[PDB]
RNA sequence: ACCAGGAGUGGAGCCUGCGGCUUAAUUUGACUCAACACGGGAAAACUUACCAGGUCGAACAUAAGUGUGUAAGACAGAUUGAUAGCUCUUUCUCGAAUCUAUGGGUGGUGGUGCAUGGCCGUUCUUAGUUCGUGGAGUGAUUUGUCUGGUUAAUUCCGAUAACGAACGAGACUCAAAUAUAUUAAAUAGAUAUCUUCAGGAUUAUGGUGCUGAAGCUUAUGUAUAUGUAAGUGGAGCCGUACCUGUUGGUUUGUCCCAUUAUAAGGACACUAGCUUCUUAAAUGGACAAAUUGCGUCUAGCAAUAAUGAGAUUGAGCAAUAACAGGUCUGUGAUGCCCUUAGAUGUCCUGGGCUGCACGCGCGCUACAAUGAAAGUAUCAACGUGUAUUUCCUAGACCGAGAGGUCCGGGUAAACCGCUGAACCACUUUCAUGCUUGGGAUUGUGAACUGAAACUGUUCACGAUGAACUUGGAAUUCCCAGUAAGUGUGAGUCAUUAACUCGCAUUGAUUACGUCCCUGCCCUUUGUACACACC
């Protein structure tokens, strides 16, 4: 009968991810999404590294590469009915909604 | 069992199998180097069935004893080939049909409160045995 | 159909480079097949600031 | 479209397409000066804000160059006939943004090292687009076979610390002339604090501005009447 | 969990010295979370002392943390 | 850089790297620091550039067959390495791009890094550079950019000979310690009780106890277990609670409901599981008048103060001027040079890049009782894992093994996985004896991955046990979770680490200095030094 629609939110600016919190769910629990917070995921660090010089002839040094990927969860207890506004609406550069219908 | 430490625990279980009948051997208890590290056989048996102790916490903390998950973890402290020693996944055998030896899916239906409490029934006779 | 063979699906040869046709100083694995020289060009803007 | 992809496959697989979009951004929309693009993904499309100077000649008769971008990337990258959608955007303050100042120089070498002509008014260019700091640097072979550089400068470039991954943009360029080749690159330093600065992050390297004291009357006499 | 069959049980000393002060703290007595002190803190072996000394990270260029190899005929 | 050491290599065998050797070729770039397990250079083919055989063709205006077949394809026997109708003995054929000698562009891992772009390297672990405005000089050039004190410092007082300067340094960005005091979990869970997984008699025993309990076998049925009696045997039996353990939900708890079942709506504890915890998304965070017989009133160490905090502490970052450093073989970066139906281009079949009397470097297991074995106990962390590619593997099962079969999980806080890593801890076998130390060495089969394994793709067994007993002169590395011991992940990867990056574990000795040593920084002074003491 009711429904129940967990809704991942991914990206890599935190700020970003400090964006979506910032108006995503003020403006459902208005209408009492039950978002049960801001559910921290660990992050998802990418390390590369490579060498510097194409050709690499002398003082063979090494050169890292981060890289820093983070989500934050907000699962939300309401009819599809419900969450077709919260999909149009906010919208942030980066991040990205994962919600499935079928 | 969460008792005392299962250096000697791990000792008397395995003669009370061999004492009940239990012993269900494999008939190549001689041959089989326990794993793809040893140069020489094993001294006897008496730790091929023994691992039920080891089963005993990890049936209480790991898993259900799959026997992938079994032989990996356990019995891996080698040095192989000369350059340089590495890990093992020692490859039990017959120990496949330890289940047989005892008589989702649970590993055994005596290892409860049946038979792993008797052995609790040795170690509180153990108790009485460290009494004086 | 004729006078081509190496049936290319075993070996390095022939999964290269897809971003440079360059061989033998690639980076295959992680999605990437970047050609690490290349990739010295092209770290940016695909993340991967450096940090430490 | 849609895979069962993982995540950092995914992440990396925008990258790809990104750090893939803007050589050949530079290839056709040099003529334009090309800055940048950004592009975002909204639900049911997404979206290619590109940036550049001529905008104009972005767009040519009877909007054929638009769907020029429209019919490239969907034949390029195969996705939806719809949910791709470009649209060009004039860059704001061009010589302040000095990317394409360093397409255009390109289009200024052929004045026969036109130094005193173009290239140094480039430096007085970046002063005419008031900038804070500028650099610019051309190596090659000049007057004879032997390579050489200049570096004429204007102002103040960091190249340490936070801020110079941030504030100094700089921007290679190569190109073709007849001798074999004359590497441009140029090193620019712009005020980010005070003009409008919409979203540049509003920074703050390392300055102290001071708050005046604000001097009081210590007295403070009541003359306090009961309304 | 972590550590090691020496460092995991470094650990519990700062495990039992903690628990006795703040149940001493808050429910029993002043004093009595006095009189587990001091007769501790005459050496005290660092029982409530949890030093952050963890490992140091490599460099390239070398094996380890900070040595290396070398004499490429120096 | 020593010193006080510690570990080392240089000795030994082996893997490689470079040479030299040779060869059809053993393709090559790189030669003091700043070439040498480098070129990410862990190669059967591919790579591949080299060597043999082959093979392919690519543009146009001209032009001459006309369309009486200009073509293009196969059989067939030759040529083959394979059917290359590439060629062809003889055959039919889609015929037209008029298949051109002719424009000449095209490719190139072909040449020059001493013609270049780019990046990178070192100069230099540094603390060092510059500019306007003055006085200094005819001028090159100085001054600012210093005497001293101090600093990691061109960092600062301070002489203050422009400064307000400017780059560098610092500042800044990134990492466990930090009140969860705030909201934060399909991670963990703390808990709590509901439980279920229940021994002790540790408990209280009610019934029971020598009367046959407990325990035991035989018989067959049921598809061997079980039932019972007999068999059998002489004290216990059986239930509960307390003590110690699985489990499931304990999400706005219970009972409600709507619902197939969550919630509130209905009340109760009014909290019949909350956030310690891992995770942040924050701000806290030695946040330093911290007192100290004041050093040029300022940067008087003191260890003293905290009690998450005596830096939680390493990295990245890097100026001016430069080098004939390295890279044309990373690139559609490129001058020029060279070549192009007869290729250096290109695809095929091979070969090689691995070959060896020898030299040299990075590095692996040793040379053993602190040890080699057997056992037992039983702690990681960084990570990684399959939808246009064969990944991670759970489970059963089979096989000395190697592996193989069958069936899952998993696009990943959720599954592999609580990755329950190694060395070490604990009893034994050993009894120092090139031994059981040490596993090179050669046979043999069994295997895996793949079209293909042959100074080998790797892997299993039972043989084979050499050198090797702490390594000469020389010589490298480094100061706290560091050195070293000890694993593991990732990187390349059809299979191949024996190397390189990261990760954790075990955890020391010694210095807390100085300028003999090789050092390095614009202070003074010397010169007959240009390309600067080679």
Same mark, same amino acid.
């Given at each position: 009968?009711?429904?129940?629609?967990?809704?991942?939110?991914?990206?890599?600016?935190?700020?970003?991810?400090?964006?979506?919190?910032?108006?995503?769910? @003020?403006?459902?629990? @208005?209408?009492?999404?039950?978002?049960?917070?801001?559910?921290?995921?660990? !992050?998802?660090?990418?390390?590369?590294?490579?060498?510097?010089?194409?050709?690499?002839?002398?003082?063979? !040094?090494?050169?890292?590469?981060?890289?820093?990927?983070? =989500?934050?969860?907000?699962?939300?207890?309401?009819?599809?009915?419900?969450?077709?506004?919260?999909?149009?609406?906010?919208?942030?550069?980066?991040?990205?909604?994962?919600?499935?219908? &079928? | 069992?969460?008792?005392?430490?299962?250096?000697?625990?791990?000792?008397?279980? #395995?003669?009370?199998?061999?004492?009940?009948?239990?012993?269900?051997?494999?008939?190549?208890?001689?041959?089989?180097?326990?794993?793809?590290?040893?140069?020489?056989?094993?001294?006897?048996?008496?730790?091929?069935?023994?691992?039920? /102790?080891?089963?005993?916490?990890?049936?209480?903390?790991?898993?259900?004893?799959?026997?992938?998950?079994?032989? =990996?973890?356990?019995?891996?402290?080698?040095?192989?080939?000369?350059?340089?020693?590495?890990?093992?996944?020692?490859?039990?055998?017959? &120990?496949?049909?330890?289940?047989?030896?005892?008589?989702?899916?649970?590993?055994?239906?005596?290892?409860?409160?049946?038979?792993?409490?008797? #052995?609790?029934?040795?170690?509180?006779?153990?108790?009485?045995?460290?009494?004086? | !159909?004729?006078?081509?063979?190496?049936?290319?699906?075993?070996?390095?040869?022939?999964?290269?480079?897809?971003?440079?046709?360059?061989?033998?100083?690639?980076?295959?694995?992680?999605?990437?097949?970047?050609?690490?020289?290349?990739?010295?060009?092209?770290?940016?803007?695909?993340?991967?600031?450096?940090?430490? | 479209? @849609?895979?069962?992809?993982?995540?950092?496959?995914?992440?990396?697989?925008?990258?790809?397409?990104?750090?893939?979009?803007?050589?050949?951004?530079?290839?056709?929309?040099?003529?334009?000066?090309?800055?940048? %693009?950004?592009?975002?993904? !909204?639900?049911?499309?997404?979206?290619?804000?590109?940036? &550049?100077?001529?905008?104009?000649?972005?767009?040519?008769?009877?909007?054929?160059?638009?769907?020029?971008?429209?019919?490239?990337?969907?034949?390029?990258?195969?996705?939806?006939?719809?949910?791709?959608?470009?649209?060009?955007? *004039?860059?704001?303050?061009?010589?302040?943004?000095?990317?394409?100042? /360093?397409?255009?120089?390109?289009?200024?070498?052929?004045?026969?090292?036109?130094?005193?002509?173009?290239?140094? +008014?480039?430096?007085?260019?970046?002063?005419?687009?008031?900038?804070?700091?500028?650099?610019?640097?051309?190596?090659?072979?000049?007057? +004879?076979?032997?390579?050489?550089?200049?570096?004429? %400068?204007?102002?103040?470039?960091?190249?340490?610390?936070?801020?110079?991954?941030?504030?100094?943009?700089?921007?290679?360029?190569?190109?073709?002339?007849?001798?074999?080749?004359?590497?441009?690159?140029?090193? %620019?330093?712009?005020?980010?604090?005070?003009?409008? *600065?919409?979203?540049?992050? =509003?920074?703050?390297?390392?300055?102290?501005?001071? %708050?005046?004291?604000?001097?009081?009357?210590?007295?403070?006499?009541?003359?306090?009447?009961?309304? | 969990?972590?550590?090691?069959?020496?460092?995991?049980?470094?650990?519990?000393?700062? /495990?039992?010295?903690?628990?006795?002060?703040?149940?001493?703290?808050?429910?029993?007595?002043? &004093?009595?979370?006095?009189?587990?002190?001091?007769?501790?803190?005459?050496?005290?072996?660092?029982?409530?002392?949890?030093?952050?000394?963890?490992?140091?990270?490599?460099?390239?260029?070398?094996?380890? /943390?900070?040595?290396?190899?070398?004499?490429?005929?120096?």
């Amino acid at each position: 009968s009711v429904h129940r629609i967990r809704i991942t939110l991914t990206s890599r600016n935190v700020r970003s991810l400090e964006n979506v919190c910032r108006d995503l769910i @003020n403006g459902a629990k @208005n209408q009492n999404l039950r978002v049960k917070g801001p559910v921290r995921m660990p !992050t998802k660090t990418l390390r590369i590294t490579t060498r510097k010089t194409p050709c690499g002839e002398g003082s063979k !040094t090494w050169d890292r590469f981060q890289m820093r990927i983070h =989500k934050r969860i907000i699962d939300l207890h309401s009819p599809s009915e419900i969450v077709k506004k919260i999909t149009s609406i906010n919208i942030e550069p980066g991040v990205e909604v994962e919600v499935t219908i &079928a | 069992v969460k008792d005392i430490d299962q250096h000697a625990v791990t000792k008397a279980v #395995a003669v009370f199998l061999k004492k009940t009948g239990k012993l269900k051997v494999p008939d190549q208890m001689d041959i089989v180097k326990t794993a793809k590290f040893k140069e020489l056989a094993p001294y006897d048996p008496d730790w091929f069935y023994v691992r039920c /102790a080891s089963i005993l916490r990890h049936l209480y903390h790991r898993s259900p004893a799959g026997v992938g998950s079994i032989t =990996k973890i356990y019995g891996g402290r080698k040095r192989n080939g000369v350059h340089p020693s590495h890990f093992c996944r020692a490859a039990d055998g017959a &120990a496949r049909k330890a289940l047989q030896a005892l008589e989702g899916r649970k590993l055994s239906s005596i290892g409860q409160r049946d038979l792993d409490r008797i #052995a609790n029934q040795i170690v509180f006779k153990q108790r009485d045995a460290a009494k004086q | !159909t004729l006078w081509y063979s190496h049936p290319r699906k075993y070996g390095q040869g022939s999964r290269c480079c897809r971003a440079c046709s360059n061989r033998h100083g690639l980076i295959r694995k992680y999605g990437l097949n970047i050609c690490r020289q290349c990739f010295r060009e092209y770290a940016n803007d695909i993340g991967f600031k450096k940090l430490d | 479209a @849609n895979l069962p992809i993982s995540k950092k496959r995914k992440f990396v697989s925008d990258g790809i397409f990104k750090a893939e979009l803007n050589e050949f951004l530079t290839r056709e929309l040099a003529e334009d000066g090309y800055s940048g %693009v950004e592009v975002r993904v !909204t639900p049911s499309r997404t979206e290619i804000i590109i940036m &550049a100077t001529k905008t104009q000649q972005v767009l040519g008769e009877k909007g054929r160059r638009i769907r020029e971008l429209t019919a490239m990337v969907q034949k390029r990258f195969n996705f939806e006939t719809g949910r791709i959608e470009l649209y060009a955007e *004039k860059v704001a303050a061009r010589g302040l943004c000095a990317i394409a100042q /360093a397409e255009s120089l390109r289009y200024k070498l052929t004045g026969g090292l036109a130094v005193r002509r173009a290239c140094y +008014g480039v430096l007085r260019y970046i002063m005419e687009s008031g900038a804070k700091g500028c650099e610019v640097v051309v190596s090659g072979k000049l007057r +004879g076979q032997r390579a050489k550089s200049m570096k004429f %400068v204007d102002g103040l470039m960091i190249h340490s610390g936070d801020p110079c991954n941030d504030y100094v943009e700089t921007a290679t360029r190569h190109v073709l002339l007849r001798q074999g080749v004359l590497g441009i690159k140029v090193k %620019v330093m712009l005020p980010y604090d005070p003009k409008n *600065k919409i979203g540049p992050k =509003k920074p703050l390297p390392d300055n102290v501005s001071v %708050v005046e004291p604000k001097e009081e009357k210590i007295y403070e006499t009541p003359e306090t009447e009961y309304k | 969990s972590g550590g090691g069959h020496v460092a995991q049980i470094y650990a519990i000393r700062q /495990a039992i010295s903690k628990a006795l002060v703040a149940f001493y703290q808050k429910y029993v007595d002043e &004093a009595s979370k006095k009189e587990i002190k001091d007769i501790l803190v005459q050496y005290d072996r660092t029982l409530l002392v949890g030093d952050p000394r963890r490992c140091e990270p490599k460099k390239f260029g070398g094996p380890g /943390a900070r040595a290396r190899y070398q004499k490429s005929y120096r």
